Amino acid sequence: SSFSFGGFTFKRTSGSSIKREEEVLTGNLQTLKIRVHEGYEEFTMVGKRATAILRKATRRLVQLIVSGKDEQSIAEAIIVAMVFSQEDCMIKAVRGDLNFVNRANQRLNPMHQLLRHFQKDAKVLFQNWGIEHIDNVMGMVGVLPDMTPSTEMSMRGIRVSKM
């Protein structure tokens, strides 16, 4: 529909999805109960410092083309997208405990807890997502897990566009 997550306005342009509660295992073998969105969808993510076009299948980011003000703003959109995708490699990239016990995390649904976790440090998220060789498309660049640009390789399904 039209909703917000991690500071971005999401607007669905194609497809549809249904919700099914599912148990997932983190890289720390912690069980999380998440509402999995099933179905292929395309979205525009609109933020104050970055915008993107997201194509996602059930628990699988297919493509993310992002533009933004700078490396940091772009990385923020990428993190929000990777979390939003509900991919297994993102869930498995959680390597410590996801505290649901403490007073401050009570109002946090799993997806929002995952988001907070990766926003604190996205190093393992980016390093475990995977890289691919990229085809040459002008006006688009690949981005390595350290957010340095490359015309050779990129984080899987991720491309950076010029503003």
Ligand SMILES: C[C@H](Nc1nc(-c2c[nH]c3ncc(Cl)cc23)ncc1F)C(=O)N(C)C
């Ligand atoms: C705020 C968002 N609200 C909505 N999310 C979705 C949605 C569609 N496909 C998705 N895929 C993944 C996730 Cl994660 C959420 C969605 N649709 C309508 C919404 F109000 C939400 O519930 N989460 C990010 C968990």
